[PDB]
Amino acid sequence: EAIYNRMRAEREAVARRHRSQGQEEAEKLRATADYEVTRTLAEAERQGRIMRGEG
Amino acid sequence: KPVNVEAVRELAASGVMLTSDENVVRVEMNVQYRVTNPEKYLYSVTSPDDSLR
């Protein structure tokens, strides 16, 4: 039983590593997407401010 | 005493085994053998098939 548990745990370690790598990559992609969204919104707001200033 | 020289005989050996790196594997094996010189097969070992298994 101890040997079976050891083998099962050492396989679950690899499974956990794969899942964690996937989740970390997903989080990085989400972060950069949010940064791009904020950049576009800020640029549009700046143009709007310039236009209101002209008015 | 007749001995079935020409026929091919089959044997199955299976068991849970321990590997080198402290691991456990379920392993099976098949072995196919013939019998020659039947005097040796008959007057050497009791139940030669079990001994071979």
Side-chain angles (χ1 to χ4, degrees):
Chain A
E1 198 195 317
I3 301 301
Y4 292 176
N5 287 15
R6 195 267 307 278
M7 294 182 286
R8 209 181 305 134
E10 66 91 13
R11 299 302 296 166
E12 289 179 333
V14 176
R16 253 185 298 271
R17 183 251 291 289
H18 281 155
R19 263 144 196 170
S20 298
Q21 274 205 280
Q23 291 175 299
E24 173 193 9
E25 292 296 328
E27 184 66 27
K28 285 179 168 178
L29 292 196
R30 293 206 225 281
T32 188
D34 299 326
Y35 160 67
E36 279 298 334
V37 170
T38 289
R39 208 288 317 284
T40 61
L41 273 175
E43 183 76 51
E45 214 289 326
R46 169 252 196 169
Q47 293 188 28
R49 279 196 203 211
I50 285 189
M51 191 145 57
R52 302 187 189 233
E54 311 162 18
Chain B
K1 186 81 174 50
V3 186
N4 194 356
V5 172
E6 297 291 4
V8 161
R9 291 153 148 166
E10 186 185 4
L11 187 145
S14 66
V16 175
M17 295 296 172
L18 276 76
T19 70
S20 164
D21 61 285
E22 282 94 328
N23 282 7
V24 169
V25 289
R26 173 53 151 271
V27 169
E28 41 266 30
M29 181 145 278
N30 187 302
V31 165
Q32 296 159 336
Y33 57 91
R34 196 86 61 80
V35 59
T36 72
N37 45 65
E39 71 276 14
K40 298 290 182 67
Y41 167 85
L42 270 175
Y43 307 133
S44 181
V45 179
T46 49
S47 83
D49 315 284
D50 281 278
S51 87
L52 190 137
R53 175 158 52 257

